Amino acid sequence: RGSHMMKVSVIGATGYTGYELVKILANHPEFEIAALVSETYADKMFSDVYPRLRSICDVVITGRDYDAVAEISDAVFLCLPHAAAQDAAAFFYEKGLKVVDFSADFRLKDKKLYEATYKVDHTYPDLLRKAVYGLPEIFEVDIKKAELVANPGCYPTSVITPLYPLLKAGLISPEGIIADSKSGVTGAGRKADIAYSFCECNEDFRPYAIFSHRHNPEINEVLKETGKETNVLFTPHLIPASKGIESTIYTKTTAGLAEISACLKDFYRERRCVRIYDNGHIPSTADVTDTNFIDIGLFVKGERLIIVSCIDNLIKGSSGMAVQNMNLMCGFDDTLGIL
Amino acid sequence: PRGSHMMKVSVIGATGYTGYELVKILANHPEFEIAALVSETYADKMFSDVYPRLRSICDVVITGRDYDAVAEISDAVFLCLPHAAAQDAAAFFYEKGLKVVDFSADFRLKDKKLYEHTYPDLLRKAVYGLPEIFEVDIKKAELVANPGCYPTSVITPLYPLLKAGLISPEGIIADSKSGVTGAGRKADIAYSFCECNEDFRPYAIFSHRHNPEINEVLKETGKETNVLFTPHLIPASKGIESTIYTKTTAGLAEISACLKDFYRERRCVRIYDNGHIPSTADVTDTNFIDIGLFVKGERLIIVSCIDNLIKGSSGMAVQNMNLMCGFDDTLGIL
Ligand code: NA
Ligand code: NA
């Protein structure tokens, strides 16, 4: 209704995650957009860059003035790349804003692991200790008290969410897990690279980053929080489609389907974004594209458990989760303005 | 140009996507010459009425299912017929002395028990037509079962490694992905443009018919495997990629040496061990199988890519026919 209105800004607003985030913020009943920052498209209206939003979000894009942003905003979403994200997050944090950082810079509590993976130095160790990993259906208790939240990566969301309760309850082995995952091309971001051009990706399907994708350590670092050390092997693939992630996950269980289903449905019992199937239904990316849902299908044969996990990469894998995090930091329901 | 060793060949069930790709290859083949193209649905239409891309290339008039007429004008026949029909046709042309390649599954598994099958005597005689492995058996046969498309991408890289004992036979996982042409020319809502476009999905979990095919054939290595196979539908027309997870004790150089030695004379097999990752666009519209190899500690990851309608079907079928007819297996392909 506007009674608990808060001003929110987006830094790095013209990438694909910024577009999905603005779409949500525009219709959110308590967040009011204050600034949309992009150094490249400054002095243009957001609807000049994204004409689909003409007459819905016509806010004039401004340049990088962080003092300007802090003085007009209660909260900021950072869609910046690494390193720049650290400086901005640190600035807006001490100014007293609520901060959601899309980047990886504050996700990994282990500083050397970060520097080794991202090949850049981490210069805010105390802030790194304070940041909360933004998986709303798992770490809600901690997010509600946070002022700095590291938004999870898109592939880690699709793999962590179904595995977390089963590891913690001891129903699957922590060793030998294979996640064979596939994403739409929007996962590369708004890029001019030849490798992301239409003619190179259209009709093509490929693995990439074999034994080397920066999300594999994130998955295993977070799942350690279940009390069990994991060695998930993660391999991504590029789908000739704009949006959508599917993860096929292979595990070993001593339990039967009924117990595995009860563990997941009990753990996610109040979480409207989590849709769990145990009846033979197979999630596909079209079931979750343009939604904030995560769909999980369960299949058991003997000791083999296969999990199919689907999300929209830009919404449950990024912007929608970012708004759930912001909702939670602001005292709102996690699904406010979402579903 | 007609060749000095010309032979006549017919195609039964010619108007599906496998028949289309097969006709493309036959029309350019320097020795095979098309005699009949049979399709009860499109009889009395020219092949290029169904596939206008082939206009002025293959304008052969399609005929109905009169198998005596085919046998009288053909030295050999390709059967792209559905289950059961394929059994009677292959029994007929075998009696009449024709070389036969059957695209269906009805003659792939020697063990009748897995099928449950009429013609059990004939089932004994059918040869599994994986040309880069069973060449010996193929040349001496009169009935070949063309292998399935997914088994082709998975058996081919795993066979030598199991035989040489370089990977474990237990615990192998094949996570495989295919273009929609793998469903054949069908009027099903599930295969419509609007249902498949922009969508990606696993299917047939724990239940795809190609998965016992993979394991039955790999038993010929001397190893009892339990390959877990899961297929997925790509929103693209053609192409298979198989990501294969194995356990090895051997190093990259040894695994590579095994594969490149076992396939050293086989021009359709392209093996990479240098970090190059194959993609479906590298093999689409070709008869190549591209294999990438990746080792970390005890983990071997294999990436295997084919055109599902050519190397996984029609181009392989012409390899099998070439071999049965005394030609080099890549004649008219490379
Ligand atoms: Na709003
Ligand atoms: Na020809």
Numbering used by the authors:
A (entry chain A): -4 to 334
B (entry chain B): -5 to 110, 117 to 334
From the paper:
While four of the homologs displayed no FPR activity, ArgC from D. acetiphilus (DaArgC) showed a formaldehyde production rate of 8 µM/min, which was about fourfold higher compared to the Pi route with EcArgC as FPR. Based on the kinetic parameters of EcAckA and DaArgC, we speculated that DaArgC was the rate-limiting step in the cascade. To that end, we solved the enzyme’s crystal structure and identified key active site residues for site-directed mutagenesis. To increase DaArgC activity with formyl phosphate, we aimed at improving accommodation of formyl phosphate in the active site by introducing larger amino acid residues in key positions to close up the active site of the enzyme, excluding binding of the native substrate. We targeted five residues of DaArgC (S178, G182, A183, Y203 and L233) and used iterative saturation mutagenesis (ISM)26 to screen for favorable amino acid substitutions. WT DaArgC showed a turnover of about 1 s−1 on NAGP, which is in line with activities of other ArgC homologs.
We identify promiscuous FPR activity in four enzyme families and present one homolog of N-acetyl-γ-glutamyl phosphate (NAGP) reductase from Denitrovibrio acetiphilus (DaArgC) that produces relevant levels of formaldehyde.
